[PDB]
Amino acid sequence: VETSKFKFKCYGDFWLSVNRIYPEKRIELQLEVFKKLQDEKLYIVGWFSKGDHAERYARKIMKIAPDNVKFLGSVSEEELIDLYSRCKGLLCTAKDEDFGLTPIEAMASGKPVIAVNEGGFKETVINEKTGYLVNADVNEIIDAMKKVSKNPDKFKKDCFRRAKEF
Known part of the structure; x- marks a missing residue:
């Protein structure tokens, strides 16, 4: 996994x-x-295939989402790198x-990661060292996010290091 093109700008x-x-x-x-x-604010990078069945789910998601959530859609690598470099942290909830x-x-960008304790997240994130691993649970995620909010650069150096190990 290449991580040389990622960098740190700020904890936005x-x-x-x-x-x-x-x-x-x-x-x-x-x-x-x-x-x-x-x-808090959430920027979601990702879209869907027009004409596909998933479109119904996608549009439903966007209508039930609160005003503090932004759907960016599909972005370029330049954009992705910049987003990673300026986010407060990364949130992962996927199961696939x-x-x-x-x-x-995200860690290559010096950012902490809050993710469900599953798949590749469990294999990359180090609980309480480069972020937090929790269950797919609203309250658990919020508690983890609140910790990061109090000390954004708490795991900066550890994140840069962990990213090099892949």
Whole structure:
């Protein structure tokens, strides 16, 4: 996994999630989280295939999402790198990602990762060292996010290091 093109800019005031708008990504969970954390912001990178059945689910998600959630759609690598470099941290809730590419890219950017304790997330994120591993649970995710909010650069060096190990 290449991570030389990623960099750090700042711990911005927005959380990031990189995942297509499909059921297996548990986008609904992310929405429930920000419906409670009205003081936080989420930028979602990912779209869907027009004309495909998934479109119904995608549009439903976008209509039930709170105002503090932004759907960016499909972005270029330049955009992705920049988003990783400026986010406060990465949120992962997918159940079909076994490699943990997104956590690696986020950590290569010096960012903490909050993710469900499954697949590639469990294989990349180190609980309490480069982020937090929790269950697919609204309250658990919010608690983890609140910790990061209090100390954004707490795991900076550890994240850069972990990213090199892949």
